[PDB]
Design a protein around this motif. Sequence first.
Motif, PDB file in Angstrom:
ATOM      1  N   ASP A   1     -61.930  19.498 -39.463  1.00 19.70           N
ATOM      2  CA  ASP A   1     -60.589  19.484 -39.051  1.00 19.70           C
ATOM      3  C   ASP A   1     -60.148  18.132 -38.419  1.00 19.70           C
ATOM      4  O   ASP A   1     -59.014  17.990 -37.933  1.00 19.70           O
ATOM      5  N   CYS A   2     -61.026  17.147 -38.348  1.00 11.88           N
ATOM      6  CA  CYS A   2     -60.824  16.030 -37.428  1.00 11.88           C
ATOM      7  C   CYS A   2     -59.559  15.225 -37.667  1.00 11.88           C
ATOM      8  O   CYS A   2     -59.012  15.192 -38.807  1.00 11.88           O
ATOM      9  N   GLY A   3     -59.133  14.533 -36.625  1.00 13.41           N
ATOM     10  CA  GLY A   3     -58.086  13.524 -36.772  1.00 13.41           C
ATOM     11  C   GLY A   3     -56.639  14.024 -36.763  1.00 13.41           C
ATOM     12  O   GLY A   3     -55.686  13.198 -36.717  1.00 13.41           O
ATOM     13  N   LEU A   4     -56.461  15.359 -36.774  1.00 11.23           N
ATOM     14  CA  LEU A   4     -55.150  15.978 -36.901  1.00 11.23           C
ATOM     15  C   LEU A   4     -54.843  16.697 -35.586  1.00 11.23           C
ATOM     16  O   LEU A   4     -55.407  17.758 -35.230  1.00 11.23           O
TER      17      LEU A   4
ATOM     18  N   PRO B   1     -53.320  18.985 -32.952  1.00  9.74           N
ATOM     19  CA  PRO B   1     -52.498  20.201 -32.941  1.00  9.74           C
ATOM     20  C   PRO B   1     -51.010  20.036 -32.556  1.00  9.74           C
ATOM     21  O   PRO B   1     -50.141  20.711 -33.124  1.00  9.74           O
TER      22      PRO B   1
ATOM     23  N   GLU C   1     -49.675  16.072 -35.479  1.00  8.82           N
ATOM     24  CA  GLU C   1     -49.730  16.150 -36.920  1.00  8.82           C
ATOM     25  C   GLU C   1     -49.545  17.613 -37.398  1.00  8.82           C
ATOM     26  O   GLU C   1     -48.849  17.867 -38.370  1.00  8.82           O
TER      27      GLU C   1
ATOM     28  N   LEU D   1     -47.964   1.280 -35.006  1.00  6.67           N
ATOM     29  CA  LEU D   1     -49.182   1.125 -35.805  1.00  6.67           C
ATOM     30  C   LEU D   1     -48.930   1.127 -37.307  1.00  6.67           C
ATOM     31  O   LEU D   1     -49.465   0.302 -38.039  1.00  6.67           O
TER      32      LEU D   1
ATOM     33  N   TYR E   1     -49.352  -2.025 -40.732  1.00  5.97           N
ATOM     34  CA  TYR E   1     -49.978  -2.133 -42.056  1.00  5.97           C
ATOM     35  C   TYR E   1     -48.843  -2.608 -43.015  1.00  5.97           C
ATOM     36  O   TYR E   1     -49.029  -3.334 -43.980  1.00  5.97           O
TER      37      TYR E   1
ATOM     38  N   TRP F   1     -59.220  14.021 -28.434  1.00 12.21           N
ATOM     39  CA  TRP F   1     -60.626  13.613 -28.531  1.00 12.21           C
ATOM     40  C   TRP F   1     -61.052  12.765 -27.327  1.00 12.21           C
ATOM     41  O   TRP F   1     -62.211  12.350 -27.217  1.00 12.21           O
TER      42      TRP F   1
ATOM     43  N   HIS G   1     -60.031  18.379 -29.354  1.00 11.55           N
ATOM     44  CA  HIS G   1     -60.087  18.249 -30.787  1.00 11.55           C
ATOM     45  C   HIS G   1     -60.752  16.958 -31.224  1.00 11.55           C
ATOM     46  O   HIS G   1     -60.374  15.920 -30.757  1.00 11.55           O
ATOM     47  N   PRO G   2     -61.694  17.016 -32.160  1.00  9.05           N
ATOM     48  CA  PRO G   2     -62.457  15.853 -32.576  1.00  9.05           C
ATOM     49  C   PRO G   2     -61.694  14.845 -33.406  1.00  9.05           C
ATOM     50  O   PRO G   2     -60.843  15.232 -34.189  1.00  9.05           O
ATOM     51  N   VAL G   3     -62.006  13.562 -33.217  1.00  4.57           N
ATOM     52  CA  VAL G   3     -61.525  12.454 -34.042  1.00  4.57           C
ATOM     53  C   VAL G   3     -62.504  12.229 -35.214  1.00  4.57           C
ATOM     54  O   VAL G   3     -63.645  12.640 -35.153  1.00  4.57           O
ATOM     55  N   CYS G   4     -62.049  11.613 -36.293  1.00  2.00           N
ATOM     56  CA  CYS G   4     -62.849  11.395 -37.455  1.00  2.00           C
ATOM     57  C   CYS G   4     -63.520  10.064 -37.274  1.00  2.00           C
ATOM     58  O   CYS G   4     -62.963   9.152 -36.726  1.00  2.00           O
TER      59      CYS G   4
ATOM     60  N   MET H   1     -57.285   4.256 -35.131  1.00  2.00           N
ATOM     61  CA  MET H   1     -56.263   3.897 -36.118  1.00  2.00           C
ATOM     62  C   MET H   1     -55.838   5.136 -36.916  1.00  2.00           C
ATOM     63  O   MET H   1     -56.650   6.045 -37.228  1.00  2.00           O
TER      64      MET H   1
ATOM     65  N   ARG I   1     -54.810  11.184 -40.846  1.00  2.00           N
ATOM     66  CA  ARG I   1     -55.808  11.496 -39.843  1.00  2.00           C
ATOM     67  C   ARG I   1     -56.008  10.273 -38.985  1.00  2.00           C
ATOM     68  O   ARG I   1     -55.743   9.171 -39.391  1.00  2.00           O
ATOM     69  N   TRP I   2     -56.449  10.486 -37.763  1.00  2.00           N
ATOM     70  CA  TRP I   2     -56.840   9.402 -36.852  1.00  2.00           C
ATOM     71  C   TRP I   2     -58.362   9.172 -36.956  1.00  2.00           C
ATOM     72  O   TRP I   2     -59.190  10.135 -36.968  1.00  2.00           O
TER      73      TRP I   2
END
Lengths: 26, 251
Positions: free
Chosen positions: A2-5, A7, A10, A22, A26, B14, B116-119, B204, B211-212
């Motif tokens: 589930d990472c990076g999103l 709650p 996103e 950010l 890019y 995270w 919640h975990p980061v990637c 980033m 995703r982060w």
Amino acid sequence: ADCGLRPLFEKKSLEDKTERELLESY
Amino acid sequence: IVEGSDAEIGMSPWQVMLFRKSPQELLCGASLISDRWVLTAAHCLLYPPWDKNFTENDLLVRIGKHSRTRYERNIEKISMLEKIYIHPRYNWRENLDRDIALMKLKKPVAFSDYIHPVCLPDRETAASLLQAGYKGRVTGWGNLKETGQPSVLQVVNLPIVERPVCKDSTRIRITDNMFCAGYKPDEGKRGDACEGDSGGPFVMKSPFNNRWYQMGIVSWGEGCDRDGKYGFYTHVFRLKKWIQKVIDQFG
DNA sequence: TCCGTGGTAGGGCAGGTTGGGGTGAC
DNA sequence: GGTGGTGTGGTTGG
Ligand SMILES: *C[C@@](*)(O)[C@H](CCCNC(N)=[NH2+])NC(=O)[C@@H]1CCCN1C(=O)[C@H](N)Cc1ccccc1
Ligand code: NA
Ligand code: NA
């Protein structure tokens, strides 16, 4: 998995106050 | 974090606080990568030139926080550590090369709105995003100037810098296991991490999938937010196989 | 063209949780 | 209080 999103961001399609900064970099 | 601002709630779920049981003091940042694993900077735990060497029972981690000191009831998670793993090639004497550590939690943590975990980055993401000029984001409860500490979590966005500039900026020997980030003196805008923000994530946002990703760990600096001077961060994608091995070997 | 044999440090010259590969650095 | 507040919502109970 589930990472990076975040709650509260996103998963709601809601942007934080400075994230565009950010994306424009890019 | 110097010249940043307050974080929005859940903005960095995270983000992890490395805490010492006694005295009850905040040592460092860290970050949640799985339900059982937290990634920090090695020097947060082991720094022999000052005889720092923290055991598994010296510390806690606090996840989901926003207030620096206050217990955030039904929001935060406090976890005890099973095991600490430092990179075998961590060089405390010379340049904090491979300044990285992993801490296995005694039990798995439940994710939530605040936790919640980061990637971690793959090759393609990393190739794509680790480019001078692109901005990432650093968070922590470290100091606000260099000479005090924040009421709540601080965030700042800073650009990745070309390696020759990073190399010329500092007296210290720098390895390709580390990158630098910050504004240059003629860019006008300012900002940096500072003491106490070590182990905190440089992250980033992937334009390809939303995703982060954690590209760096706050490692070191000379002052904080000094013109001509840049914050140095552990190059996380370079050490990802170690991270993998340890997890898969000792989970 | 180079990136291990001590170094942050044991025992050993391989490999491990580590000597890969990189916005490489020399 | 337990973890702040001339506090009773908040990022959370009562
Ligand atoms: C441990 C972290 O809290 C801290 C973060 C400093 C980040 N500063 C900026 N401006 N981005 N790390 C350090 O303080 C590291 C750990 C020990 C020494 N250190 C330094 O920053 C020294 N200023 C520089 C240095 C000294 C010796 C070896 C490497 C770097
Ligand atoms: Na060796
Ligand atoms: Na209360």
